[PDB]
Amino acid sequence: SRKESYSIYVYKVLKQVHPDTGISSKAMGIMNSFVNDIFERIAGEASRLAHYNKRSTITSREIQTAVRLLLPGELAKHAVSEGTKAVTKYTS
Amino acid sequence: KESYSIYVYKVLKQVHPDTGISSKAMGIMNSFVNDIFERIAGEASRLAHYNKRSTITSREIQTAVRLLLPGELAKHAVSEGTKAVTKYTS
Amino acid sequence: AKTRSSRAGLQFPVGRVHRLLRKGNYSERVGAGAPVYLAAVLEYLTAEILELAGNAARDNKKTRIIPRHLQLAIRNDEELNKLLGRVTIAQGGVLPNIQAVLLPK
Amino acid sequence: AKTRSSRAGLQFPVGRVHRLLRKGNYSERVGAGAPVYLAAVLEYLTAEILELAGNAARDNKKTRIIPRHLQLAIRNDEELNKLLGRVTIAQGGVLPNIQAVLLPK
Amino acid sequence: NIQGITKPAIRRLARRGGVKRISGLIYEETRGVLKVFLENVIRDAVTYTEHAKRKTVTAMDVVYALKRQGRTLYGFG
Amino acid sequence: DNIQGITKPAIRRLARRGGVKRISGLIYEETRGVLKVFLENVIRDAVTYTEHAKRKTVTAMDVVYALKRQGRTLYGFGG
Amino acid sequence: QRLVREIAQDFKTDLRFQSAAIGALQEASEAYLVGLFEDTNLCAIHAKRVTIMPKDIQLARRIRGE
Amino acid sequence: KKPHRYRPGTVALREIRRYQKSTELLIRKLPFQRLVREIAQDFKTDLRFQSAAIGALQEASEAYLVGLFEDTNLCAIHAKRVTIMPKDIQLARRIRGER
DNA sequence: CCTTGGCGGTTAAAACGCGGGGGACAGCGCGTACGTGCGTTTAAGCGGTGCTAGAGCTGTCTACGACCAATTGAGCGGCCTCGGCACCGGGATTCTGAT
DNA sequence: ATCAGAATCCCGGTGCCGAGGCCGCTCAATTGGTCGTAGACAGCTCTAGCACCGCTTAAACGCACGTACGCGCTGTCCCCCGCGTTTTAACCGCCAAGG
């Protein structure tokens, strides 16, 4: 009975931003909760966006708009930068 | 563009045969019907996902109704739903 | 031929509801009873609100229900009011209500 | 075998995110860039929160981040606080805050 | 343009809200509040408008923005 | 009568965390009422989920879903 | 209308508005303000006053999570 | 020498600082467990519970009550009082849209 | 000698009460802000008149995504090790109140 | 101002247990290839959005004014607070009853 989670990716990110810092199991649980929450928010909003515009496909544009609706200000701008850069690099 | 206008009007004629409705009021009732549709369908969708079921059935609809509707409205709505399914099935 | 609504004893469109469920990105499949049930629930709620609002319209010596009547109907009903606690009814106004302390005497 | 995450320059799993989009009943089709974008955003947000929480952990002379640090990080940051305004962090407690009028006079 | 939301209009709104007596400082305060509210809705609304590759804010854009703020509006669908 | 298990000093502690310096005597009973209502609303939904899944065991996820649909999103128990 | 278009110009440029859009914004705005004034009134009455003050509005908005 | 005696408020303030500094649950585990099982028993009988379910319920309940007490405190202070009363809880919950 | 069922002994957290001190309440007095009204004014509303930007719609071309075999290694489950600190023992700091 | 006393912060210590590290499977992520339909791009249009203006007047703006509500100051009883005093729930613990 295998369980998947975002734990290892959260940990990799943690090691990126704080090389000498660890994290409790409970705090990791809270981070997993967080990631799932924001996923369900963004994906949901993007679903609605696609539906409103009679589109059958969720693209990076739906994701971007959803990010702009859900996140406040600078958080939104920075997230948009990360997303756009990731997609542009990925396609290349 | 579709709407629930004709069905709302039919229902209105059932409960008040000599009563009409303004255009604005009909647009509010359309808003209402679409809203409750989304609440119930959304909750039923989540119910189906949580339980790893790929099919939304009348059971999800019922549970969703029990979650979303308060008290007496829930009981009566559940009664009407089950009653309608039973009659349709017959 | 006879309709999924005729057979269910409903006024609300079972076929339409079914189609909206299928294309609403809710689940990969949709059961036969689900749109019947849902249509029945929607019709029931509509009936309750139109009942009360019709009463208000008759009380205002009107033959046509207007948004004001819908507002009065919904807000003066406890459960309908909770159900629609976060909803704004355009041109509905508010319930007449003055806090007792504000009474001049 | 180079992965989509590697190509996108990310730590978060693009393939997994894609699968979750596909089976989450969000849309009939999913573009190639959507899971990349989403994974990138999720990764970024995770990074911001871990940054602030790590800072809070070091402020308490602590090397391990605990839920308290996450709470301090989120609540002392205006935009994260907005984003998570309706979220409860278990074992997070609250920000120290005493109303001035309550202090001795 | 915020001053276009005049004192007697605010008084009317307060009356509908059941307010009997009103401080002089209320009006400016109210304007600030109103401004914020609008900024929050319109922002989201316009976001929708731009996602649709349009240049005209529709009633539905507004409705979606309000809905996503948990300020659901009936009557403009 | 387990609502009385939520004692005066426990409520006092909760209020302290909430920044309360001084507490009227009638508060505690009031609080017991409020909490009771709160629990009734969450647990109800939780049990509903449990009943939908044809289980006899309330899971952490059932609670989490109930809290979420009540706009009380809870982090830390998805594991 | 003027206020709405002005605020909107600060987000996205050369925008156009349906009349129904502006109307929707006005119904929403006025409903919001009215409800806020109800809560504000409750705060003033709570403080044994009959007169609403900015303080009351600020309390109401703080408890609302605004 | 009369024994030592802090003035009313001092220990209260001390407690505020103490409990705002920490994160431990403030309601006793076992009685909370009993309350939850009692209430749940009134909806469905012979229910069982994961321990994490009850823990989730307690974290949620205490966060809720704490926030409520913040708002209540603001209501009391607004009325130029230092003591929270039922009118302050009722006002807070009314403005929250809980009642 | 072996098995099982009471009343104490000790820990730990919590109402009663007794003094007690200060704080909401009510009252009195003072100040000035604004409702009510009056005189003066103009911009929103009605109703036209004209000009035009671009979304709905249609059509045409297509390529990225859905779907289906093959492939394989980091993800996941189960153990192994070791240092940060909760608590403990003990001394220096610091409010805190009565004088 | 001034000092005694309790709560608080800080200096060894300590061992322990849970997080970090690691080793062994395997299925889900990755690779390659093939259909195909929803997506991307160009054009018609005419509809609703927008710019400009004559006529109207009641809503809006400026000012008189006086008092009643907001605010400052004071008397007061009573209503929670601090700490001693019990007060109560819970985990043993041992001796007595029975075979």
Residue numbers in the entry:
A (entry chain d): 32 to 123
B (entry chain h): 34 to 123
C (entry chain g), D (entry chain c): 14 to 118
E (entry chain b): 25 to 101
F (entry chain f): 24 to 102
G (entry chain a): 68 to 133
H (entry chain e): 36 to 134
Please give sentences taken from the publication describing this entry.
We named these structures RNAPII-nucleosomeL40 and RNAPII-nucleosomeL60, which contain DNA loops with 41 and 62 base pairs of upstream DNA, respectively. In both structures, the upstream DNA is sharply kinked at the DNA exit site of RNAPII, and is folded back toward the downstream nucleosome. The upstream DNA spacers between RNAPII and the nucleosome are 10 base pairs and 23 base pairs in the RNAPII-nucleosomeL40 and RNAPII-nucleosomeL60 structures, respectively. In contrast, the nucleosomal histones in the RNAPII-nucleosomeL60 do not directly contact RNAPII. Therefore, the nucleosome of the RNAPII–nucleosomeL60 complex may be more flexible than that of the RNAPII–nucleosomeL40 complex. The upstream DNA spacer of the RNAPII–nucleosomeL60 complex is 13 base pairs longer than that of the RNAPII–nucleosomeL40 complex. Consequently, the nucleosome orientation relative to RNAPII differs by about 50° between the RNAPII-nucleosomeL40 and RNAPII-nucleosomeL60 structures. The DNA-binding surface of the proximal H2A, H2B, and H3, which formerly contacted the DNA, becomes accessible and captures the upstream DNA. The length of the upstream DNA that directly contacts the nucleosomal histones is approximately 30 base pairs in both structures.
RNA polymerase II (RNAPII) transcribes DNA wrapped in the nucleosome by stepwise pausing, especially at nucleosomal superhelical locations −5 and −1 [SHL(-5) and SHL(-1), respectively]. During nucleosome transcription, RNA polymerase II (RNAPII) gradually peels the DNA from the histone surface without histone dissociation, until it reaches the center of the nucleosomal DNA (the dyad DNA). Conversely, in the histone chaperone-independent pathway, the histone transfer from in front to behind RNAPII is proposed to occur via the formation of a template DNA loop, in which the upstream DNA exiting RNAPII rebinds to the histones within the partially unwrapped nucleosome downstream of the RNAPII. In the present study, we performed cryo-electron microscopy analyses of RNAPII–nucleosome complexes paused at a major nucleosomal pausing site, SHL(-1).
